[PDB]
Write a protein that binds this ligand. Sequence first.
Ligand code: 1Z0
Ligand code: NAG
Ligand code: NA
Ligand code: NA
Lengths: 11, 293
Amino acid sequence: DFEEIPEEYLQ
Amino acid sequence: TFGSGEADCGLRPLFEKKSLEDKTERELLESYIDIVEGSDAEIGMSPWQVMLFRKSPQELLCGASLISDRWVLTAAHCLLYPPWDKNFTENDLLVRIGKHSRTRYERNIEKISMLEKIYIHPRYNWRENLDRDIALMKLKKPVAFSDYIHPVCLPDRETAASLLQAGYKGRVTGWGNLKETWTANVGKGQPSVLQVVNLPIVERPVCKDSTRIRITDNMFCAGYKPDEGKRGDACEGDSGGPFVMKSPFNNRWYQMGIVSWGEGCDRDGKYGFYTHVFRLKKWIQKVIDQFGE
Ligand SMILES: *[C@](=O)([C]([C][C][C][N]C([N])=[N])[N]C(=O)[C]1[C][C][C]N1C(=O)[C]([C]C1=[C][C]=[C][C]=[C]1)[N][C])C1=NC2=C([C]=C(C([O])=O)[C]=[C]2)S1
Ligand SMILES: *[C@@H]1O[C@H](CO)[C@@H](O)[C@H](O)[C@H]1NC(C)=O
Ligand code: NA
Ligand code: NA
């Protein structure tokens, strides 16, 4: 239910 | 003493800085001189509000607060709680600042920061009653402040002495459950946007009286008594979030508590328990003074 956040924050 | 942004702490760009009063702050100040059942937060109402976010899987972990451009305060149990096999490392989390919507990625509004290091009070008691439920998270790099991002002040002795009184109201904010949730239901679960609720501090004797759990001076409870009619309480998901009070002395917002624990949510006779920030402030000072502001 959470909009995915930019992948740059997951790296 | 807490990091860059302390001097201008507790003053909101969208409110104090514009001489604008939010919708319910007078209720707090009135109590000094005189989230379940809460409401949607106003934009920029709690610019220090921080959402602890799990990197993978992507999920809301807890609430938190910004105390400087590089330091975030939260509950120790939000990062470390062995009973539920919880023990995060700075690498598993992210902090989302300047958020209003719970689920939306608010581009150009929110700021997602990575953690450099997390610190949990060395004497935090997760075994019994979450005593000393306080933790700090230093961001990898300072965040720029904005209308939606601004640090809250940490209480000094005088402010704490003056405001930490039975009946004096504080404000709790979070994206936690809108009500006690135990099973699948089509009712209200989590909010669409940040929720806010103002609650009165309760006399220590009543707090201890309301629970079988051992209460310590490192915590205080807040909420309305059954005979007071009004309702409201923090709930699962609000943990780590701030319990703030607006100072009548300098009109700055001070964080006196951190959403810690409770039994159920908004139950008559029960009260939400919060970490006593002032009493544990010296730990914050020691940590920040040691690991740079
Ligand atoms: C927090 O959101 C909640 C906040 C609840 C506040 N409630 C009210 N009425 N104001 N905190 C908790 O759920 C804490 C964490 C440990 C257990 N707990 C409780 O409140 C217990 C009571 C208690 C107190 C002290 C010691 C043991 C038990 N309720 C019966 C949250 N923090 C976490 C949540 C979930 C998870 C997880 O991983 O699922 C971890 C932390 S919700
Ligand atoms: C959490 O796990 C880390 C390993 O990265 C560790 O060294 C530690 O002692 C932890 N906290 C607990 C479960 O007491
Ligand atoms: Na007790
Ligand atoms: Na109650």
